[PDB]
Amino acid sequence: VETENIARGKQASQSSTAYGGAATRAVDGNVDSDYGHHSVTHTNFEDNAWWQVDLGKTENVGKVKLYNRGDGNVANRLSNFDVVLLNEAKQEVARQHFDSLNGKAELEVFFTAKDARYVKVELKTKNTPLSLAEVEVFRSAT
Ligand SMILES: CC(=O)N[C@@H]1[C@@H](O[C@@H]2O[C@@H](C)[C@@H](O)[C@@H](O)[C@@H]2O)[C@H](O[C@@H]2O[C@H](CO)[C@H](O)[C@H](O)[C@H]2O[C@@H]2O[C@@H](C)[C@@H](O)[C@@H](O)[C@@H]2O)[C@@H](CO)O[C@H]1O
Ligand SMILES: [Ca+2]
Ligand code: NI
């Protein structure tokens, strides 16, 4: 995959915002996973919490990398979730499910050359906030 993180600085949004956890903190170019360092997002405790970045145009995506929150012993809030790729009309072009990160600070998701404008993370769990230290997105090679 290419090395340019194309998610950086792009428009981000999420299902709701709590504890000041702006959606843009996931694309601010800082993977620091301590919530107190202000670079981790946070939605409400709600069902099917989601976060999304708009790449701004359609890109051939090969890799999406999630960085989990690392403080407060609440890492397992990022579990039972999908990573979704949508085209410009916001239809799904790819979707992968994950049970867990297994205590890892990060997850690399590889997509098979998918042409997508939006990258979404969706929890499938009830009454759980979504918190991401960073989401990085990389174009397929060549
Ligand atoms: C007091 C205040 O100004 N805000 C509190 C939160 O505390 C702030 O954010 C934390 C991440 C720390 O950086 C802390 O120093 C800072 O004041 C508070 O969060 C909890 O704070 C406690 C006690 O210090 C622990 O750090 C705990 O891990 C924090 O709770 C977690 O993070 C929250 C943001 C939520 O995700 C909670 O569900 C987690 O358990 C919160 C909650 O008590 O209240 C703010 O308004
Ligand atoms: Ca960040
Ligand atoms: Ni600190």
Amino acid at 44: N
Q: Which residues of 115-124 are buried (b: 16+ CB within 10 A; e: fewer)?
A: ebbbbbbbbe
| Max intra-chain CA distance, the chain | 42
* Neighbour count for residue 9 (Cβ, 10 Å): 13
Query: Which residue shows structure tokens 């205590």?
Result: 103
Sign of CA dihedral 54, 138, 105, 39: negative
Report d(CA 23, CA 118) in Å as an integer: 14
Domains of the chain by range and CATH?
1-142 (2.60.120.260)
Beta strands in the chain (DSSP E): 11-14, 50-68, 81-86, 92-98, 106-123, 132-139
| Geometric angle at alpha carbon 13, from 102 and 28, rounded to 5° | 70
How many angstroms is it from 134 CA to the middle of ligand 2?
4
* Ordered alpha helix ranges (H), 1-123: none
Is 9 a pocket residue for ligand 1 (Cβ < 6 Å)?
A: no
Is 19 a pocket residue for ligand 1 (Cβ < 6 Å)?
A: yes
How many angstroms is it from 37 CA to the middle of ligand 1?
12
State how far Cα 39 lies from the chain centre.
Answer: 13
